[PDB]
Amino acid sequence: NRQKERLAKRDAAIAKMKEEAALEASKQPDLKKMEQESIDQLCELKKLKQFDIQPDGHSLFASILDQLKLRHDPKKLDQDMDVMKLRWLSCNYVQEHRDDFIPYLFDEETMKMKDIDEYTKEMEHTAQWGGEIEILALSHVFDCPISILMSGRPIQVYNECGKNPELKLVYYKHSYALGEHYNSLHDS
Amino acid sequence: PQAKILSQAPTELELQVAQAFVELENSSPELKAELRPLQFKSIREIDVAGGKKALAIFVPVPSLAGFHKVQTKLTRELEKKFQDRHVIFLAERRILPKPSRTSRQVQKRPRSRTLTAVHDKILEDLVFPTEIVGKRVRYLVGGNKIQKVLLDSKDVQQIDYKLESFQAVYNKLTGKQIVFEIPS
Amino acid sequence: MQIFVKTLTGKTITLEVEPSDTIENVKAKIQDKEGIPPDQQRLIFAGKQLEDGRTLSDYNIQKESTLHLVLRLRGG
C-alpha cells in the first residue's frame, strides 16, 4: 500500500516540522503571560476584578457602557442606551467641539489629517475602534470618570470632574497578540 | 510567507488573512507551531441581513482537528483583526453524484461523500464549540421545509451573536433554511 | 527653553527642553516625566502632527509654546 505509506510520511513530516518550530516557540519568550501576570498584580493591588468583554473591536464602547452601568445608579442609567448609542453620543460630543476633534482626528500614525465629521461618522456608523479622545469626550459628556490601568504604565484618569461615579477599565496590549484590547473592571 | 498558508488559489483577501495568519504565527509563542502546519484552501464572502459579512474559510478535511484544537483562539483574533466580520471555518468536502441506471460504474460511492452526509457535516462545522442535541424538519403547508437545529446550552456565548450569519451561510451553501433553538 | 504640553486627560506638563532636541528626545522626556510610552504618544504643534527624526523650532516652536500630546489607546 503506497497510499498508507504516503499518509504516514506526510504525518511524520508535519509532526517533525511542528516539533522543530515548537523548539523555536519555546526559545521565544511570551509577553502575553508577563502582561497577564502584571495585570493580575495590578488588579490585586486595586482589589477590583476584571470582567471579560466581547471581541470584534466594539470592546471599548461595550466596556465603557458596562463600567458606567456598574458605576452609575439604576435611576440615572437608561435601558435604551447601547454601544451604538454610546458611539452616537461620542459623535455628538465630537460635533460639539469640532476644533478640538479636528486636531484629534489628525493622526501622526495614520500620517493624514482625517476629517472630524468623517471620523465621527466612522465611529458612530461602523465597528472601527474608538479613539482615546472620543472616549474621553464621551466620558466627559456622561460625566463618569474613566480610570485606565495599563500593565507597565502609570494609571490614567480622565473626566474626573464629572459628578457620576468613576468607571474602571483596563486596556492590555500584549494580552491579545493582534493588538490592544479593553476589558471592564468591577469592584470585588 | 503569505503564499505558504494559501493552498492553491491566490486572491487579495486570502493573502490578507494569510498575512494575519503569519502575524499570529510569529507572535504568541504559546500557540506558535500549533497553527504552523495548517493551510487553508479558499475564502468565501457571505452577505448577511445584519450587514456584517462572513468569512467562510474552506480548509482541507484531514487537517480539521488541528483547527479544532485552537479554533476559539484564532477565531477571536480573526474577529478582532477584521471589523464588521464573522469568521467561520469549514472543510471543503467532495460530493459525488448519485449513479443512475444508464451511467457507467465508477467504483462504490462512500457514504461520507453523499450530499446529505456532507450537508450534515457542514451544519455541524458551522457550530463548532457547541454540540447539536437534536434536529427537526418543519414541513409547512406551502411545501417549504425549514430545518430546526437544537444546540446544547453550554458555552453558547461564543456563537450567540452569529446565528443569523449561520442561517445566511447555510442558505447560500445548501439552499435550505434553518432556524437555531436553544433548549433550556 | 520651557514648553507646555496639553494632554487628553487635561494635565499640562511643563517640559524643559532645547531648540535642537529631537521629537524622539521629547518623547523620551515625556516618558521620564509622566510614564507614557513613546510608542503610544503623538505630538502636535499648530494643528500639525510632529514627525520623528526632526528637531525643535523647525515649525516655529519657541519658548513658552503650547503643544498637544495625544495618546492612541486603540483598544477594541
Give Cβ neighbours of residue A174 (< 8 Å, ≥ 6 apart): A31, A32, A34, A35, A151
Q: Give CA–CA dist A100/A82, Å, rounded.
A: 25
Mutate: best of B21, B28, B38, partner A, most A CBs <10 A: B28
Residue B27 vs residues A28, A81, B35, B37, B45: alpha-carbon distances, Å: 9, 37, 11, 16, 27
Give the one of B23, B28, B36 whose C-beta lies nearest to A21's C-beta. Answer: B36
Q: Give CA–CA dist A96/A114, Å, rounded.
A: 17
Burial (Cβ within 10 Å: 0-12, 13-18, ≥19) of residue B153? exposed
DSSP string covering B117-172: HHHHHHHHHHS-SS-EEEEEEEE-TTS-EEEEEEE-STTGGGTGGGHHHHHHHHHH
Instruction: Give contacts of C35 with chain A, Cβ < 8 Å.
Output: 153-154
Give the one of C8, C37, C44 whose C-beta lies nearest to A158's C-beta. Answer: C8
Q: Which CATH number fits domain C2-71: 1.20.1090.10, 3.65.10.10, 3.30.70.260, 3.10.20.90?
A: 3.10.20.90
Residue B56 in grid coordinates: 467562510
Range of the domain at B137: 1-184
Give Cβ neighbours of residue C41 (< 8 Å, ≥ 6 apart): C27, C30, C31, C69, C70, C71, C72
Burial (Cβ within 10 Å: 0-12, 13-18, ≥19) of residue B137? exposed
Q: Give CA–CA dist C9/A140, Å, rounded.
A: 10
Q: Give CA–CA dist B72/B85, Å, rounded.
A: 15
Give Cβ neighbours of residue A186 (< 8 Å, ≥ 6 apart): A48, A49, A51, A67, A70, A168
Report whether A167 contacts A139 (CB < 8 A): yes
Cβ within 8 Å, pair B83-A17:
no
Report whether C56 contacts C28 (CB < 8 A): no
Work out how many domains chain B is built from and give that number.
1
CA distance C23 to chain A (A): 12
What are the start-end ranges of the E strands in chain C?
2-6, 12-16, 41-45, 48-49, 66-71
| Interface residues from chain A to C (CB-CB < 8 Å) | 56-60, 102-104, 106-109, 129-133, 135-136, 148, 153-154, 156-158, 171-173, 179-182
Residue C55 vs residues A113, C20, C62: alpha-carbon distances, Å: 22, 5, 12
Report the relative pairing of strands B42-46 and A106-107 from DSSP bridges.
Answer: unpaired
Give Cβ neighbours of residue A103 (< 8 Å, ≥ 6 apart): C44, C47, C68, C70
Partner A contacted by C50 (CB < 8 A): yes
Q: Quick one: how far is CA C5 from the chain centroid?
A: 6
Report whether B170 contacts B146 (CB < 8 A): no
Side-chain-facing half-sphere of A46: CA atoms under 13 Å: 21
Q: Give CA–CA dist B32/A117, Å, rounded.
A: 42
Burial (Cβ within 10 Å: 0-12, 13-18, ≥19) of residue A113? middle
Sheet holding B132-139, edge to edge: B132-139, B145-151, B177-181
Q: What is the structure's resolution, reported in angstroms to one decimal?
A: 3.0
Chain B partners (3+ C-beta pairs within 8 A): A
Cβ within 8 Å, pair C35-A154:
yes
Report whether A147 contacts A168 (CB < 8 A): yes
Q: Give CA–CA dist B106/B99, Å, rounded.
A: 8
Report whether C37 contacts C51 (CB < 8 A): no
Q: Give CA–CA dist B4/B15, Å, rounded.
A: 10
Chain A partners (3+ C-beta pairs within 8 A): B, C
Give Cβ neighbours of residue C6 (< 8 Å, ≥ 6 apart): C12, C66, C67, C68, C69
Q: Quick one: how far is CA B116 from the chain centroid?
A: 16
Nearest C-alpha in C relative to A54: C76
- State which fold the A11-187 domain adopts: Cathepsin B; Chain A (3.90.70)
